[PDB]
């Protein structure tokens, strides 16, 4: 492989913080090209953002002798005062004069890897500033243009995305550099060209059949186009490339999950890709709590992923204990698995750590209304609530509150207009992603179930005649529904609450599919037979109802103690003319 190869896919693993992932890069170039300094200088790069810099410093002081590579050096050096607990005024001082004299005696290349860094800590304009420089000196580089235009795309401005296409599209037209073929591939990305986002990848395949992030990236892009199995097949590529690629694993979990719903294969998948991760990049906390997102949101309360889950949460908080988001989702993962003890000593642990995590204060209080705490929730949330001016309106604050008037026993009209509020925010922070792993993320289909669940709650079951106008509550029921199913299919649960509210809003024959549909999936789910049962009342069909009731105690029998099989069984008695059997169930 060229170094030029090497090279871009370290500045994009370093764009992603594959922090092991550039480290194996550059050793990788340094048995293959051990001359060339760039190598050396990533590798003492990745080892700092590992957390060791004892031999930071020294490799960083070894390759301070060459030029281009002293630049980025003196700015690594600055950041490694920068991420100290205890920084050196003095040293940092030194530095700032060191860097600055490098400055008036600049290279191309030098600005070129100082730009890098000053991207990879965040300081855009700095490294606007370098990429200025070395553009003067070198009259206008092409490698310059290029990274000046990955700078525009991920400034994230509109106006910025143009220039950077056309730097892409002048570096095209001389040079096949992958670094400017990546960015017309984001550049088509932002705008929303994922037909020609794929094209451009799969030119950028022809290009070059070896290149793991452009097949990662055609992937997503496959995943952006509503088409799971082509996907599939790119995951399947990938891993008959390369078998232990997190994308393609975490893809293929993600297919099992959302789209099949075939719980035992997700997991082995998903213990599989954490043992391949664990082995290759261990000490990238940040990988695992992006990685746990979807899974959490989307397993359907699944005990067996939820472990899984947890088990890597675990792990990550064991890499770093100092993280205030870490504890918060382990707080939100154990809420997940019903454990309301364990969450509210996660939440303390939390709100510890640091006060400004408003999301703990939100998870704790609503463990404090769980566990019927009302006095210290109320208190909490007016605190919460006056100090929203630095935060803002969030879905969660608002689903608190429609908690509360839920408590309270407030007027139903309120608790309906804060729950449409919530309803409200949450589809607006939707609006605009494209179906993808954020898409999973951020629609949070377990928030919109329990959403529904406090709606069926306060709405009576008393189906609807038809021809009578519905509330607006059970339409956007029906909507939100449609909507996770259609992103969602592989959640059943969300099938049935489409039965339900069908059933609540006088649509037996939708209610009636969406049941059966949910017993050839699942035979055992009890409430798909016992609302089947009730449609079936409904449909005066008795005989049907009764072996309906009769398949319901048969695979559980604790229904007895549900006052709803009494009383269709009741209602059935009375079909059938036994009022005494009526009069005795």
Same mark, same amino acid.
Request: include cysteine; charge should be negative.
């Given at each position: ?208 059949? =070896?290149? *793991?992030?452009? !097949? ?8 952006? +186009? /509503? #088409?799971? &199995? $082509?996907?599939? @097949? ?124 408003? =999301?703990? *204060?939100?998870? !704790? ?8 705490? +009302? /006095? #210290?929730? &109320? $208190?909490?949330? @007016? ?143 009890? &409430? ?58």
């Amino acid at each position: 492989m060229d170094s030029q190869e090497l090279k871009t896919l370290i500045n994009y693993y370093c764009q992603e913080r594959y922090f092991h992932h550039v480290l194996l890069v550059a050793s990788e170039g340094i048995k293959r090209y051990g001359s060339d300094p760039v190598f050396r200088f990533y590798h003492a790069y990745g080892t700092l953002m590992e957390g060791k810099t004892q031999e930071a410093l020294r490799e960083f002081e070894a390759i301070k002798n060459k030029q281009d590579v002293s630049l980025c050096s003196l700015l690594a050096l600055i950041y490694a005062h920068k991420m100290s607990p205890n920084p050196d005024r003095e040293a940092i001082l030194e530095s700032d004069a060191r860097v600055k004299e490098q400055r008036k005696g600049a290279g191309e290349k030098a600005l070129y890897h100082a730009g890098l860094f000053l991207w990879h800590i965040g300081r855009h304009d700095k490294a606007r500033e370098y990429i200025d420089r070395m553009i003067k000196i070198s009259d206008g580089s092409k490698q310059g243009h290029v990274l000046k235009a990955w700078l525009d795309i991920t400034r994230g401005k509109e106006p910025y995305t143009k220039k950077a296409l056309k730097y892409f599209e002048e570096g095209l037209q001389d040079g096949n550099d992958t670094f400017a073929l990546l960015g017309k591939a984001q550049c088509l990305e932002m705008r929303q060209n994922y037909s020609g986002a794929l094209e451009t990848m799969n030119q950028i395949i022809v290009n070059f059949p =070896s290149f *793991l992030p452009a !097949f990662v990236k055609k992937m997503k892009l496959q995943l952006a +186009l /509503q #088409d799971w &199995d $082509q996907t599939v @097949e790119t995951a399947q590529r990938l891993l008959l490339q390369d078998s232990q690629n997190v994308e393609a694993l975490r893809m293929q979990a993600l297919y099992y999950v959302c789209r099949e719903g075939d719980i035992e294969k997700a997991s082995t998948k998903l213990e599989n890709l954490g043992n391949a991760l664990d082995a290759m990049e261990p000490q990238n906390a940040q990988l695992f709590y992006n990685i746990t997102l979807a899974f959490s949101r989307t397993c359907g309360r699944s005990q067996l992923i939820l472990q899984k889950i947890q088990t890597l949460l675990e792990r990550a908080f064991s890499l770093n204990p100092q993280q205030s988001e870490f504890a918060t989702e382990l707080g939100y993962q154990m809420i997940l698995q019903g454990r309301v003890k364990e969450a509210l000593k996660w939440y303390k642990t939390a709100m510890t750590l640091d006060e400004t995590s408003v =999301s703990a *204060l939100v998870g !704790f209080i609503q463990c404090q209304l769980i566990e019927g705490q +009302l /006095q #210290d929730a &109320d $208190q909490q949330l @007016e605190f919460l609530n006056e100090i929203q001016q630095s935060i803002g309106k969030s879905a969660e604050l608002i689903y608190l509150h429609a908690v509360l008037a839920m408590k309270k026993n407030k007027r139903q009209e309120e608790v309906i207009n804060l729950l449409n509020d919530v309803l409200d925010t949450h589809f607006s922070q939707l609006e605009g992603l494209p179906l993808g792993i954020q898409y999973f993320e951020k629609l949070n289909p377990d928030f919109l179930l329990e959403i529904v669940m406090e709606y069926l709650s306060f709405c009576p079951m008393q189906p609807a005649s038809p021809g009578q106008p519905l509330c607006p509550l059970l339409r956007r029921c029906i909507s939100v529904l449609e909507t996770v199913v259609r992103t969602v299919p592989g959640l059943l649960q969300t099938v049935f609450l489409i039965a339900k509210v069908k059933y609540l809003s006088g649509d037996i024959e939708a209610a009636f599919n969406n049941l059966q549909h949910c017993l050839e999936h699942n035979p055992s789910y009890a &409430d798909a037979h016992l609302l089947l049962a009730q449609v079936y009342l409904s449909q005066e069909k008795v005989k049907l109802c009764s072996q309906s009731l009769e398949l319901c105690l048969s695979y559980d029998f604790k229904v007895r103690d549900y006052p709803l099989y009494h009383l269709i069984k009741a209602q059935s008695q009375k079909k059938m003319g036994e009022i005494a059997d009526a009069i005795k169930t």
